[PDB]
Design a protein around this ligand. Structure first.
Ligand SMILES: *[C@@H]1O[C@H](CO)[C@@H](O[C@@H]2O[C@H](CO)[C@@H](O)[C@H](O)[C@H]2NC(C)=O)[C@H](O)[C@H]1NC(C)=O
Ligand SMILES: *[C@@H]1O[C@H](CO)[C@@H](O)[C@H](O)[C@H]1NC(C)=O
Ligand SMILES: *[C@@H]1O[C@H](CO)[C@@H](O)[C@H](O)[C@H]1NC(C)=O
Ligand SMILES: *[C@@H]1O[C@H](CO)[C@@H](O)[C@H](O)[C@H]1NC(C)=O
Lengths: 124, 104, 124, 107
């Protein structure tokens, strides 16, 4: 059915559509583990801190990892960036986020999640 | 590069990996923690190159720690040469800018 | 009872769950006209051409519009660009994309679309 | 600020719109948006205009000044040559891109 497993960063709580979703067995730290294989949609916006607030001159980078190999590698000059995309996956896949410095992110208004893909056999 | 260490890359991507790859081209440094690519961030004498970041490095050109030195732009804190354990005494002790000299 | 569409650049055709989705009345331009009010999720990747195939000094910028009001404004140094985010709108709002130069855009592997968000009431 | 214009913006974002296209008048400043919502800073050299490619946000390059015109400043605007012959005088120096033509004073 419908498994959208959103994760707010402020509350560190996985807002879910179902008690124990069919497609995901989530974790509290923001990581997750794929249950059912198929097509998915990683989504979410990542709000960075203002350029004034940053300490280190480390660049703004947001990556997405499937298991241990890299899936997505995004970077902009400290502006609002959305993440994700359509990706077909197998079962038991780790989907998490690694960014170079956890110090330069806005915990408020930052979210990420994954959705199962209903089949798309119609075209117009 | 070295007999008991691992050569990877060519030209400016040259580095010596272990079984902590270290870019050997002067004033070139690892850009990623895995040192997949070597980047260019020169310093001045008496300074090393700190690299904060967990996926892609940013570079601060911090001064040399006590007990070390660096007389080039490459930004690497090489350890002082203790002439005493090598065979000589030390004429000038050495500082951040400069390494000690040995008296034959 | 799901409503999901996706426009591809190569096919220039929308791939849908249903022939006439209740939530939208798509335009083959690539724009879309929503019909159902509620929570939506704009998604999709925008892959530009290599920085050697470029022509002008115009920077890579991708915008998203609500009617005629701007909704999103993204930019990077000509690499992969995921777009969108969670947004709640109402019946009859114009959603489309404006670029800086359409010659920046590589048609292969570039897509976008919106899905009606099944509400997530649970938490974890 | 201009006869057929009204003043918009202040400081370096100053611009005088007409008709609705505008021109940043602070030197070496140019419209960054098609509606010139903000003025940006991109100086050039003599004999060079400032082309601005883009449909939402402009990119810049110091393209040279078209033939028949000139530009003796870093602002990057092709001001037109003075054709004294059709205007009333003769010309001592014909002029090039870097400088303006000169006209002879005695006649
Ligand atoms: C054309 O470019 C030349 C570049 O040197 C300049 O020539 C002018 O003409 C006199 C001739 O005696 C030169 O000695 C000077 O360098 C220039 N005169 C002045 C007053 O600057 C000049 O930049 C350009 N000339 C014109 C007429 O545009
Ligand atoms: C370091 O020692 C050398 C050797 O005498 C000297 O010339 C140089 O000035 C010293 N620099 C500092 C900062 O002490
Ligand atoms: C759907 O969009 C088309 C675009 O050509 C338009 O002609 C049609 O009227 C729209 N449908 C409705 C119900 O407005
Ligand atoms: C332009 O004006 C702003 C004031 O809004 C000022 O801070 C800046 O120094 C000026 N010069 C620039 C941006 O080169």
């Amino acid at each position: 059915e419908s498994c959208m497993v959103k994760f707010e960063l402020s509350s560190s709580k996985w807002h879910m559509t179902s008690p124990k979703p069919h497609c995901v067995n989530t974790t509290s730290d923001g990581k997750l583990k794929i249950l059912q294989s198929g097509t998915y949609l990683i989504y979410g916006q990542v709000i960075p801190v203002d350029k004034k607030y940053i300490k280190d001159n480390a660049p703004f980078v947001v990556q997405i990892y499937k298991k241990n190999d890299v899936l997505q590698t995004l970077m902009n000059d400290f502006q609002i960036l959305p993440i994700g995309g359509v990706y077909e996956l197998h079962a038991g896949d780790n989907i998490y986020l690694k960014f170079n410095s956890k110090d330069h992110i806005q915990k408020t208004n930052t979210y990420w999640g994954i959705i199962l893909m209903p089949d798309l056999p119609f075209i117009s | 590069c070295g007999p008991g260490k691992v050569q990877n890359g060519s030209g400016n991507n040259t580095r010596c990996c272990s079984l902590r790859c270290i870019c050997v081209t002067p004033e070139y440094h690892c850009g990623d923690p895995q040192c997949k690519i070597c980047k260019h961030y020169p310093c001045q004498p008496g300074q090393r190159v700190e690299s904060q970041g967990d996926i892609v490095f940013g570079f601060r050109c911090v001064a040399c720690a006590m007990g070390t030195f660096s007389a080039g732009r490459d930004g690497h804190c090489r350890l002082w040469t203790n002439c005493s354990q090598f065979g000589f005494l030390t004429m000038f002790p050495g500082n951040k800018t400069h390494n000690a000299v040995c008296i034959p």
